[PDB]
């Protein structure tokens, strides 16, 4: 049982030991396109880049590079796109990707401002009446509604393809209380958020991969996808003891470097998968307790 393994690591105290062990075992592939000089200004951080083999490609003829990776969990049967917080010049590429990849939801795990350091550009509209128009990529983006909550906000947006006039609804799930290099307040607030995303249908396979991003697209975004994927496998395999989080995290790291940034984020991942297993085991109604426990009203 994975519950045992956790209590061992805690008493033993070897979380950073386990952590550093995974950095050591993580894959490492070429990143040539990311390192081209013409692409210097399309990366927020110089030590964070997509592998050539899983990088998302813009369907534009000029320059097809965006700092985003397709994480295709074959067994779990779910694909994610992890990406950096858009830069002032890459907002148009962000929504071009969202359109071309047919995504229906975007999960944003950081805030535009975080401890005085700008970690993301304001790439979605905040007022219904001031919609954004990205001319380089020919897209229009309109806020349609929002549902503010004590620690997260769900927005509904209309993404229009000016070239064809076609339009699509995009769900924006913004988690506003997750500090960089930090962890959510509780497994409950986290799982309540995850399951909100799940219930929206954004994670369904009729849709393109959900886009997940934070500042760099590896640390908080990593924690989110690990938890969802482990919960998926426990359900698909039919046994909670089956899943080896370390083996799952290493699988994800074949697709984008650096997923999960602190030893405490790794611990929260065990914690959250352990809690979420209650739901997978059949205890349908623990979900309503998570909503209650998270104080999503205020």
């Amino acid at each position: 049982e994975m519950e045992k393994e956790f209590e061992q690591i805690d008493k033993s105290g070897s979380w950073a030991a386990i952590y550093q062990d995974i950095r050591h075992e993580a894959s490492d592939f070429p990143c040539r396109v990311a390192k081209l000089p013409k692409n210097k200004n399309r990366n927020r951080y110089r030590d964070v880049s997509p592998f050539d083999h899983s990088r998302i490609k813009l369907h534009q003829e000029d320059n097809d590079y965006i700092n985003a990776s397709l994480i295709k969990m074959e067994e779990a049967q779910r694909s994610y796109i992890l990406t950096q917080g858009p830069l002032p010049n890459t907002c148009g590429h962000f929504w071009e990707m969202v359109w071309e990849q047919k995504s229906r939801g975007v999960v944003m795990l950081n805030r535009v401002m975080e401890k005085g350091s700008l970690k993301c550009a304001q790439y979605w509209p905040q007022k219904e009446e001031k919609e954004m128009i990205f001319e380089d990529t020919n897209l229009k983006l309109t806020l349609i509604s929002e549902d503010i909550k004590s620690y997260y906000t769900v927005r509904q947006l209309e993404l229009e393809n000016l070239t064809t006039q076609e339009t699509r609804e995009i769900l924006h799930f913004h988690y506003t209380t997750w500090p960089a290099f930090g962890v959510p307040e509780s497994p409950a607030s986290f799982l309540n958020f995850l399951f909100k995303v799940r219930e929206s249908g954004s994670l369904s396979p009729e849709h393109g991969p959900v886009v997940v991003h934070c500042s760099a697209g590896i640390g908080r975004s990593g924690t989110f996808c690990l938890a969802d994927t482990c919960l998926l496998l426990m359900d698909k395999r039919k046994d909670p003891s089956s899943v080896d989080i370390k083996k799952v995290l290493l699988e994800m790291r074949k697709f984008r470097m650096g997923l999960i940034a602190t030893a405490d984020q790794l611990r929260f991942s065990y914690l959250a998968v352990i809690e979420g297993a209650k739901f997978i085991m059949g205890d349908s109604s623990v979900q309503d307790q998570w909503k209650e426990l998270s104080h999503e009203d205020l």
């Binding site: 951080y45 030590d47 590896i218 650096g258």
Partner: peptide, 7 residues
Amino acid sequence: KEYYTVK
């Protein structure tokens, strides 16, 4: 900081 692992 331009570098993801900062001091």
